[PDB]
Symmetry: D2
Subunit: 114 residues, 4 copies
Amino acid sequence: PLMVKVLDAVRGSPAINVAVHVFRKAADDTWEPFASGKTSESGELHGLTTEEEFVEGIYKVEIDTKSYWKALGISPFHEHAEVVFTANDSGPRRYTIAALLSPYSYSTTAVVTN
Amino acid sequence: PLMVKVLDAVRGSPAINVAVHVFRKAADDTWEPFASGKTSESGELHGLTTEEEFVEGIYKVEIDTKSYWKALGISPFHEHAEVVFTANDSGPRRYTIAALLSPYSYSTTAVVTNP
Amino acid sequence: PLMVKVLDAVRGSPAINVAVHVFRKAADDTWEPFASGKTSESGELHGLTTEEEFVEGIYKVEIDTKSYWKALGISPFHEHAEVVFTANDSGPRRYTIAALLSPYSYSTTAVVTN
Amino acid sequence: PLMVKVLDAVRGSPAINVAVHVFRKAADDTWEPFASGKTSESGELHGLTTEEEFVEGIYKVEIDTKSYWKALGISPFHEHAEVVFTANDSGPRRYTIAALLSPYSYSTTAVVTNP
Ligand SMILES: Oc1ccc(/C=C/c2ccc3ccccc3c2)cc1O
Ligand SMILES: Oc1ccc(/C=C/c2ccc3ccccc3c2)cc1O
């Protein structure tokens, strides 16, 4: 139900071994840890959750961009990239959160398919 | 020292009347409200802070993209666009945070200048 | 050796049935037709060329963004999106040209892997 | 009526001294040179054209990204960034073409205003 894809706009490559943390907003308006992992050689993180676990709610995907740039010897601007969205059941739904990284910029899009 | 510029990639226009909230990370590791405002007819938000008040720290610029799209009658994907960065750690700098918005996407960049 | 991926930033979806034309710069500095197709249900165009055909040179990938937006009833700014690059043999190489489309904007990146 | 703004996503700075060439599609379907210039210390290129000269047509703004990166000693992917659009077909408009550059990527957006 949830896939994250990270790309590097400087090297023209997948962003490999990037830490990604997913949080779910709790009733108290705090961020509860939900799922995490590191992107693969293809810049992808699969297997974060299941259809049963991935209920409607507000989610935050935090991408550890700062550690990624520092490991390549590059000085980055952001502490991290955050993607905050509502999961809405309206029909069978798969969410791909994509991020394209530069040292002083990032782009993110959602690809939501059935 | 801190300016926010927001553009709309659907209309090809400035993003007008976008709410922006700035937070600064406190000693307790919580987000303290720092400043807020709305973008103008040019999509710009000036006057958030002063050189004196804009000290070193970790800042979060929250751009209320969902409220923007919903006011135009559109159901967007994201709740907001968050830009989190350390500022002024090598002395005072001027920061422009620019954002380009679509209903299911956004881009942000920083322009950092030494006055 | 060459894959094109097109995404829609308005709908949060692959950009389906987008016409893509690839040109190679000829000795006369004109653009010779090289490969073309339409993106699939996943927004991808595979099978454009072979390793034997895809020699070093300057290539142009033209994405018919205007027809895409018009088919969705949306008024777009650009006539097309053009991606112009040199193919360089430096080692085994696969090129993915990705484009993320909005009515008044687009982003493109290259993912070049071995 | 036509302004170009270029930013560098690696340095977090304006992209200075970027060559820009503008072409207009002729009756013969060829690209006629229209105007050209270089971005300033602010990454901006003003004064390309006038309201009188900037008639209806299909225009191509070519941003010489490869020459920019190569002058900084970097080997980039793209030859240039091309922005192709119909202009002034509903009367005169003001166009800002903005570009955000990385060695293997770029983003472009248009801001179109009615004077
Ligand atoms: O500005 C941007 C430009 C491109 C992308 C995404 C590109 C891409 C490329 C390949 C993909 C394969 C599977 C799923 C999503 C995939 C997404 C995102 C941006 O924010
Ligand atoms: O993907 C992107 C594409 C274009 C822009 C444009 C940003 C801009 C455009 C014009 C500006 C004029 C004055 C000061 C800052 C300005 C900033 C931003 C993106 O994230």
